[PDB]
Each structure stands twice: as structure tokens, then as C-alpha cells.
């Protein structure tokens, strides 16, 4: 029989590809089966999980830079690194960019995973587990202060990049006496895992870090970090000529209790790798 | 170093008025405000919460901290003469100094003004008025080393002129007693940086 | 206190039933409701625009609820919801695209790559912009921001004309008084 | 297997954006999750509710205007306010507009929330809780009558605005003897909350109030209010020169048991604020 | 070990609730999500192309997740998912077709007959390419392959222009470090 | 997750205003509420 459709008129919209930005609901296959489920990764990736649970990757250590400490490094002055950041900011986003200029002045970065990740997103919030360790002999000795100060930073500016200001970091301006700090006495320990939680007057923090950010676009960078740490020799390095008259320190970085907000970054040009050309 | 800290009430200002006193503290609350050049001529303004921390004398043994969350308390007392007549109203406008002007406590009508929260003040009757302005900040916590973000302005306003005898005597006057303090406070972070 | 009355809580709802089935008591719904913001907005061709360039202006006019009431509060949260109806007469092929952009950042200082939506005059764009922010809420017209929260950037293929509407998703406003209002323009 | 669709033909209409005027069913997001629910406003707005439950806002007090009372104010005549409304109408919609004319004659208003709200809608119904209070010394004394009369009003007209008529309000024309009324005896009370319910031959009332409404478009204004009150000195103000020879009164306004009908107003030009320009 | 702290697991989720309902912790979903790969790709007329000719290039750019992250791993599996939006202005009739092709085999050394899809500017092509392979997984950019696994070949009727997007179906990546990144181009 | 639509292809016809001559199933309102039911005529028509 052909009865009649007492059914309702079912409205709609021609809208195609609805919610492709979203993560959850179709496509067109090009195979035999629409139930083409594969499996659960046995003896393919021998690990807990490497892609999801970004606490894994964001919590993956990485080295930012080394810093040399000489017996002649002034006490309670930041252990110098030229015009670039022992004057260490705290935060995931990238800050230490450099230039390949050939008049071209194209900037590049050395972001670790914990950073590389966030340059995807717009805003961030997480704890930073740094881990500092020295390379030394036993004869090398001294004391070192690490002190954390939220907020802005005394900076120096350029039309291509920024830098830290050592002058505002003398022991007289920032004594680091009551502030949150650690003292590492090389003679008894050599590695410190510094777990710094997320603390701000903003529930979350921006992820721009440094990008198109120089003397002019500096305030975004000031807005991109929760604070900044400082390393300073509190006691001079004691080193007989039996060994090197200096030592060095390394700054592992990872994160915990991590979280991100949105996948659109805060730049003016999309993500792009510096794919090394043949020559300068 | 120490367990607990200061909630000590402290004074800010004390003002006086007399009948026939044509001034910004008079011309009480023009009905309408058409031009931005004849705004509602107010009487007194306090940028909060800075002025409190600054003039209150709590800074020294409160400074060396960065983030703060707090609810300000305030109260006004009076011991004025009876022969005066009139009434006042106190209110607060968050971020009035920066939002679009048309949304300011000024540049509006007296009706809109009083629409704001607060409490009133009879020259003669409201002997001791109190008020509690909560944490109106959109920001989680208030910075101190900067102290720059007074997340509210506190405006006093006059309802009716200072009314009294034809020609007033000296004690034919009004006087005010402000006191500002805090409750619901929580401080955390040490920092060498200092508010100048 | 002293209070008197010349003599209700049901006659209201009763004369409502027999007169109007809409027992409106909450405004929040009236924020989820849309309302026209502009009659035949224009837009440059094959290019893009930060919708603020339009929003901010109509905001000052109070032509709709989410601005009219905005002039009555200070703070809000939640995700706005925008709609574009095409009315442009002539085109060859018509993509219309939408991206995200911090509230008051400019088109040049921002990426064009990210969560987006696209459609084809289907003549309509029906997006919902969420609430991503950094303090806890937002002062409704804080002139001072480096793009605290999120908003919309819009791209079209051709010199375009659109009708526009806006509302809230959970969108919600702090209490305030109200400003003076403008009436007729009876110039002579 | 590919069986055949014995399913029905499912009709439709291309209708897009169906029911955008309405309040309840989709849109396109631009984020990660379609379950993007936020929360329930903890420690954001410390209040019961400020937006919904308009009885809150519509029940939010506000001051319309002050009125001066001198010992020389005639008894049982309306306490004068120039050519504008102590001759107080009752109703939410706006009535006291003024002009910024520069030949331009653009009208503006001072609507309280209880009014500002309704100028959204078309029709209204609600109780008006006025609250009148005097500013005085104890020596200031006298009696005052408040009497409510429904219906029209004795008015004066202009090509730009309207006004009240005091002549038709002498004690001889409107004695106010039996009508609903209060007498405030300043000597024992100073504030009165006058709760006036909604009473009309119309289930609801119009919301136009005054707009494009002058000598000509007067009848809409006559149709926009349920009635009108009147304040009149019943006994002269008694005030020795020890104090001011006059006093003043203030009229708080709010509403209760409020309700509105439709969101389309009753004007000829859309809502628009008088955004103060730089200068006249 | 030695570990210290200056003093969380909930404040995160809490300020998330009140700020952002998206409790993103896993990336795998962000692989099922799409993202634009090219703005107005072109294509020769009435002919066909192995999509690699485009893919490989954008892969090197990291403009999207499934390449950006690719620069962070070594191995993967699962079926990719491609999308084509038409924007070409002028045509008479417009078939658009899609076939299978071993990853890096050329158009000439391959059949044009097999599992396919077709559509008609409906202006969109929305295909999901599965995981057919021969080892167990795939090195993300092994320059050396005679078409181990599968990929897409595309045909159009006319000289065509398209917007393009890509993602994964179960698509999933082995852990690695990360390379240097490129920023601005401030030539003088 | 974005699974795939194993759902059927759901046919149709563009037919608008189907059954306007009939007495029973939609239209477009111009008010607040889609549940705008009024009442049952008390003291309106005796």
C-alpha cells in the first residue's frame, strides 16, 4: 500500500562540513568496509602514551641553555650570559630568539617541547618543573642563590630582540632575602628540581611569548610570563688551578599539572619552521 | 614571621559645608547631564583600593607582598549642627575612569546615579553609616608593587543643597568623619619589589 | 519601615494566560535571543575585518539587548553568538569564512590560521564564539585591553553586504544604574 | 550488504535560521569542544541574581526628581515644579523628556531602571512601589496629602513636549476627600512606601509613555499611564527663620509583581542613547 | 633525588570550568580535528594529480597539527581524512573525483580504476583515506618508499581552485625532541 | 571523536508549505516563546 505521509515537514540547512574545526562527525571512505577499525597499538609503540596525556610530553625534560660560572663572577649579580637570558624568565612560551639576517633579519627559536607545544595555543597555565644541575669536580665549590620574583622584568630593548638588565639585579636592589628562593651548596648537592606552580592575577597566561616582539612589541612579552627567576653567585667559586677556574650549569625544563586554552596562537604570521637552507 | 595582620580602621578625609555654599560640593546632582563639560558636579572621590593602602599607614608592615584579594569596609560618621537640612548619597563605580564615558557614574542622571549600589546619608539623622564594597575586580587579585589598578572609584554626592537659616553662623556647619578598612583579606606572595 | 497599600501575584499570570502565553520573568533568555544589529553592513572584498570595527559602534548605540543592557551592567561572561545574512546582489563564487582573534587585536598583528568556519551562499553564517579570557569575567567596555578575551575575524571573497545579528550562548552579565536615553531628532 | 531504503521520503524546507527571533536551537562554534559548558558563576557576581528575576532590577529603587516645598505653597494646590511634572503620573514608561536643541530639537530622557526596562517592550503591567521621603529639620512641620486618581490628566501642550495643569488640581475641583489617599504628618513620619497595584480597564498597559509625543501625539501619552497621583500641601509648612523657610521631597521609584508583554517598543525610531557630545 | 616546591590539580579544572569548558588533556582528539593546509590551491584542468605534490610541501611547513606534530615524532598509523572546498569561479559542469594511489607512486604508473568517490559543486569533497600498509606503521617522512602505504589521487573536470584541509581518522603517532622554529621575516 | 556516519542517506523533497489546504504543521512565530499557549476562554464568550 501507498499511504500518505502524515509525517512532519523536516526543516534543515544546506550547511556542509558543519563543525570541521571541532573534534567530534563524518567523511567519505575509499575502502571496502565502513567498520574499518584497526586496533590498539600492540608492539607498535612500547610506551604508556606519547601523544595524548601531554603531561607526558609537556612533562618531557629539555635543556634550554648552559651558563658558565667563573670565580670572578660577582656575588649577587646575575651570572652573565651576554645580552641574552642566567636572567631566566619563567613560563613556557619562547623568549630567546635569534636572527638569520642576510638584511633579511628573519628570527628563529630553540623551543623545547614544553614550549614548542604552547606556541600552538593562545593561553596557558601550568607548573614548571625546572631542574638545574652543575658540571664540576669535587674541588669546585661555592654557594648559589636562586630567587623567584613574579611580574615584569628589568629589560633592555632592541629593534630586533630584547634582553635582560643586570643592573637592576644587584644584591642592593633585589636582595632576595625574603623572596621565595633556594640556596644550592655545591658541596652537598648538584641537582635541584624546582617545581614552580602557576601563580598570577590572571586565571591563565598568554602564550605569545616573544614574536614580532622587540623594543616596540615588548609589552606582549611582558604579558607572556608570570614572573622571572634569577641565578646569582652568593659565594664565589672556589677552584684551585689543579682544576678549571670555572664551572658550568644546565637548566632542564619540563612541566606538570599543565593545561592549555585555545589552539589559535597569538602571532601575526602562522607557524612555520626554519628549514635550514643550504647556506647562510 | 608573624601569624596575623592588620585590620585596623583608619581615617581618610573630613569635609565641611555651610548653607549658601555654591561650589562643586553643592549644585546637588543636576537632574540631567547633556554635555561632557557639565558633568554631575560631585563632591569627593577616592580611587580604591590604592589610597587606602597608601595613606592608611598599613603599607610598611603590609608591603613586600604582591597579590591580594580583599573586601573593603568603610563608614562615615557626623556630628553636625541640626539647623542644616539635606541629604547625601555615596556610591562606587568600578573602572569608571577607563570604561566608555557613557557608562560612567558621572555623565549620567541622578536617577541612574542612585541606581548604583550604596546607602544614603541624612545630614541630621544618619549619624553613623556603614558600607562594604566587595572585590569588584575582574582581576583575580590586586597587585601592590604597582598599586596602579584601583579597580574602583568611590564617589560621594549631594542630594539636596545644604539647607538652613537665611545667613548661617560659623557652627552652622556640617563635618564628616571617614574611616576605611578591610575584611575578607588574603595575602600570599613575598617579593623584593616595592611600591614607591 | 512604613509601608501602605491600596490593596495580583496570580491575576498577572492569569491575564497573561488569556492574553499572552509568554510568562517572561528572566532576562537571561532574552540574551540568548537574537536581534538585528545593522541594516546592510558593507565589507571590503576578498579580504577580512575584525568584527569589532562594527561591534564597538553599535555597542555605543544600544540598538540591541546585548548593548542596551550592557549600558546597565559592568561585568559579564560567556560566549557570544553572531549571525550573518547575505544580501549582496552580484558574485561569481562566494566563500565566507570566519576565524578567531583576540578581542581588540588588529587584523595585521594576528594569524589567519586556526579554528575557522566556512560557508557558501547556503547564504548564512551562524557562529558561536566562546568565552576564553584571562581574569575571571570582562568589564563590558574596558577601553584598556591587549585582547584579554576572544572574538571574531571575518573574511569574504567579494565586496560584500550583510545583515548582522548577535546574542549570547552561558552568556550573562553586575548591577548598575542606567544612563540618559536619546529620543527623536526634530531638527528645524 | 547494501539493502534498499524502504524508508520514507522525508520532506523539509530549505528554511535557514528558523526562529532566530525566538529564544530556543543551534549555531556554529569555533572552539575545540561542543560540550563547552562553563559553570555557575561562583565568586564572580556576589548576589542573588541581577539580570534574571527582573523584579530585582525593576524592583531596584531610583529617584525621579526633587520638589521644593515653601511655607508659601498654597494648600491643596499641586506643589509646583514649573511647567513639568509634583503633578506626578503613575506608570513605568518615560514621560519627562527634555530638549537639546541646536534648531535641532532632539529630545532626551532620564529614565530610571524601572522605566528604562519597559521602553524595550510594547505593553506592561506591574505594581509601582513609590517611596517618598522629605529632607528637613525637626522644626520644619506641616501636613501633606497624596491622592491617586486613575485615568487621564489635565494637561498643557506644546509642539515639543507636554506638561501638567495645576488649575484643574485646586482643592475645589479635585477635593481628594474620598479618593484613595494618604496624609503624611511630617512630625511623626518622613518616609512612605506607596505600593500602587495595577488597575485598569485594560488587562495590560501601553509602554510608549512619551515619544514623538507633543501637543499632537498627546493621546498615546494619555493612553500610556493607568492614572496619576498628586501631591498637595494640606497645611502650610511651618518653619521659623531659625532654619530654612522651605524643605524638599524625593520620590524613590521601583516596582513589584511586574510583568511585560512584548519586546517591540511603541516608537517610530529605534532605541538610541543620547551619547553626550563634546559640546552643546 | 632532590626536589622542592614553593607550594592545583583542581584549581586547574576549576578555573577551567569558569573560564573554559574544554578540559583538553589528550592530543589524539586534536588529530581528529581539521585545520586548513593551503589557501586557494590550484589544479590543472580535466586532469588528475597525486595529492602528495601538495602534501609533502605543506608537511615541510608545519602549518597544521598533522605536520607540526609530525616534526615531533617518528612513527604513526591510521587513516587520514582530507577535505576540499571549491572556490573556483567559473565552470559549465563540475565533476570532482577521487581515487586511491600508493603513497608516492606517480599518476602515470598507476591505475585510474578502483574505489573512488565523486561529487558535484554540493561543492565539497570529504573523504577519509584508510591505513593500508606493509610493515607495521610508517616513518613519518621516510624519503625511501615505493609506495608502502596508501594515499589519494584527485581528478577534476576544469582548471580548478580549492581550499584544503586534513586530519586523522585510528590515526596516531613515537616520541622525539623538536626542531628549531621560524618566526618573522623582517627583511630590510 | 569524529566517527563516521554509517547512517542512511535520508531522502526528501524540497516541497514547502506541504498541506496548507489541510488543517493539521508549522509556521514561523514572531514572539518570545514557542510554547505560546493562551488559555480556554474564561469569561470571554459566555
XYZ file of C-alpha atoms in Angstrom, chain B residues 31-37 69 82-87 89 102 107 109-112 114-116 120 122 124-125 134-135 159-161 163-166, chain D residues 46 60-66 81 96-100 108-110 112 133 135-137 139 241-244 246 250 252 274-280:
74
model
C 18.829 66.293 37.074
C 20.182 65.615 33.588
C 23.658 65.774 32.096
C 23.714 66.644 28.408
C 27.292 67.741 27.793
C 30.502 66.123 28.929
C 31.536 69.623 30.032
C 42.225 39.779 47.436
C 20.836 70.424 63.309
C 19.898 73.680 61.612
C 21.301 72.373 58.322
C 18.995 70.425 56.014
C 19.678 67.986 53.186
C 20.844 64.516 52.311
C 24.408 59.540 48.741
C 28.600 56.996 28.749
C 27.810 61.708 32.662
C 21.333 61.266 35.526
C 20.818 61.417 39.259
C 18.371 58.547 38.809
C 20.978 56.381 37.132
C 21.401 56.391 42.697
C 20.656 53.226 40.747
C 24.210 52.297 41.621
C 22.179 57.217 51.783
C 20.685 62.277 56.065
C 20.971 65.263 60.518
C 19.716 61.713 61.046
C 33.330 43.641 47.797
C 36.113 42.571 45.471
C 21.029 65.070 47.044
C 19.727 68.462 48.154
C 21.593 71.691 48.871
C 19.730 73.938 53.612
C 19.465 76.074 56.709
C 18.845 79.565 58.045
C 18.959 82.613 55.798
C 28.139 38.196 44.697
C 15.508 48.411 42.027
C 14.851 51.831 43.583
C 15.588 55.061 41.779
C 14.969 58.774 42.193
C 12.902 60.637 39.627
C 13.046 64.213 40.878
C 13.077 66.504 43.903
C 7.598 72.156 39.591
C 9.572 63.761 31.471
C 11.663 64.362 28.395
C 13.681 67.481 27.671
C 15.366 69.002 24.636
C 18.858 69.572 23.382
C 16.248 63.116 25.729
C 15.097 61.397 28.916
C 16.204 60.492 32.471
C 15.242 55.031 35.863
C 10.828 60.984 51.784
C 14.628 66.387 53.787
C 14.030 68.581 56.794
C 14.849 69.611 60.296
C 11.351 72.369 63.312
C 13.824 81.556 60.395
C 15.932 79.579 62.834
C 16.012 77.175 59.853
C 15.321 77.293 56.143
C 11.452 75.649 52.904
C 12.319 62.999 47.000
C 12.079 56.896 45.016
C 21.946 60.305 23.923
C 25.701 59.844 23.949
C 26.928 63.214 25.235
C 28.890 65.014 22.535
C 31.830 67.221 23.376
C 29.711 70.379 23.489
C 26.166 71.677 23.079
